Design a protein around this motif. Structure first.
Motif: not given
Lengths: 299, 300
Positions: A181-193
């Motif tokens: 998926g479009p995620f990265v390994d950082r602490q931030t706002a990440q949206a799942a589709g």
């Protein structure tokens, strides 16, 4: 008809505990290499914009505490494959099973061994959602938990837990460090589709209900692949391809019900609901049984 | 949100499963120390099952009539005896993979993990609960007799169930590891009728307490009720009645939260009359009754 997970014995012997500084998570011990998420080298303050390539240069071998139960494993080298740390240890795991690294597609199922501090605590079966997440049960400390399938004598590792999204879902990579998926390994706002229902798995589950005698949704009508996808698209159901029809072949011979015939039943189940009835005891349509799972558990 | 029905790791149990063959019948056995436990109807043909005389059938068997196989290594039966409905086959070699184990008998409403096996080979593991009618609702095909249920506490495996029979209603019945059946069932191929299956009320209440701890709060109401009025309503929806023992067990859950037990009973009463109305509780569109209070007051 229950959602059965694979026996976890062959994987239990490979789980270890990896500690770097204050962070402690789970690692996978195969031969002489320990695999674990690369954010184990990051502090909670380093997770804003981590420079992993620069953070790893600072660290040395004596900063990692690898623990396999009571014994202590000694790290003799380290490396990075995309988003996974590969720690070379001094002793080979004698519990190393016949294994293989594979990458799966959304809609496929596998078993997860949820661990905490290198100790297995639970196992469950789940499917990769079409938005590349999994509805798992991971608390703080289960990072590095692995997902797997079991060929007759070979264990296929396909997933490693990395992050927990602020929705209850979890995201991870394969064993080569490639994210699902479009995620990265950082602490931030990440949206799942937008999550969609796996239509081919629902059809396979409807074939399992017929095998178990529950046949009330069957009707005399049939539909076209282009007419059903119209109704499937409107109700957030993934479109049905011709390869999907080919995989449901073995289940079509055992029951005698064609695929497009069954699609007319599912089409009526979405528009009109279930009219106050139950299919295999449920009032909702299950989509975490692949066609191969139905053949495994029934025939 | 998210509350997955999780099963125990099965590794310690996998190394204890064996294959037992007597004549044509083949089922699963449990190998602990020097004894192999298995259902006693392994000495029965399909024709003996209607009216089996187990004492008559067993006195005619010898040690060499039992074929025990742990993978490829064939074990040697040196003696045998029968405890209630289970055969105890004494073998020449001890199981080196024997974990620290225990035999416990469970009550309805309690949960455990099942390792489904076929001819001594594990195939799958799932979590289930003993229903109030003393049956289990799992997936058992032909050849799964001898599969066992267990809980793992620290390092001790607590064996509590062994599969014996499948009922014509699709559910399964079995005994504890001492050979005593759960419920009124027998190991005959007769018409056996399971009781009415009801919802485990104390389990639903513990699950609802976990929901308010994990954020979900839409189902709460301002009313309270008495224990006797709630049971009069719960019995209408085929819910198990609540006893004072159930109220005391939910004590710590009502302590971490602010809602008394009789308060939560009023909310559940309102859920039963209104339904879900499209919304979910901990990601579930149904009321779950297979999570015991002990697991909720621990994995909170």
């Amino acid at each position: 008809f229950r959602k059965m997970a694979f026996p976890s014995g062959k994987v239990e012997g490979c789980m270890v505990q990896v500690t770097c500084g204050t962070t402690t998570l789970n690692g996978l011990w195969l031969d002489d290499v320990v695999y674990c998420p690369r954010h184990v080298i990051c502090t909670s303050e380093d997770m804003l914009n981590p420079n992993y390539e620069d953070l790893l240069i600072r660290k040395s071998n004596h900063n990692f505490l690898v623990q396999a139960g009571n014994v202590q494993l000694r790290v003799i080298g380290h490396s990075m494959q995309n988003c996974v740390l590969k720690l070379k240890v001094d002793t080979a795991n004698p519990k190393t099973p016949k294994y293989k690294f594979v990458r799966i597609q959304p809609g496929q199922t596998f078993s997860v061994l949820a661990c905490y501090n290198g100790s297995p605590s639970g196992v469950y079966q789940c499917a990769m959602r079409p938005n590349f997440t999994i509805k798992g049960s991971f608390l703080n400390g289960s990072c590095g938990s692995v997902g797997f399938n079991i060929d007759y004598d070979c264990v296929s590792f396909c997933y490693m837990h990395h992050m927990e999204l602020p929705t209850g879902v979890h995201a991870g990579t394969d064993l080569e460090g490639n994210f699902y998926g479009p995620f990265v390994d950082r602490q931030t706002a990440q949206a799942a589709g937008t999550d969609t229902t796996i239509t081919v798995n629902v059809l396979a589950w409807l074939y399992a209900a017929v095998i178990n005698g529950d046949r009330w949704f069957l009707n005399r009508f049939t539909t076209t692949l282009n007419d059903f996808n119209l109704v499937a698209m409107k109700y957030n159901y993934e479109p049905l391809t011709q390869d999907h029809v080919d995989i449901l072949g073995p289940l079509s011979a055992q029951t005698g019900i064609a695929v497009l015939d069954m699609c007319a039943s599912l089409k009526e189940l979405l528009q009109n609901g279930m009219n106050g009835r139950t299919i295999l005891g449920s009032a909702l349509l299950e989509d975490e049984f692949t066609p191969f799972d139905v053949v495994r558990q029934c025939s």
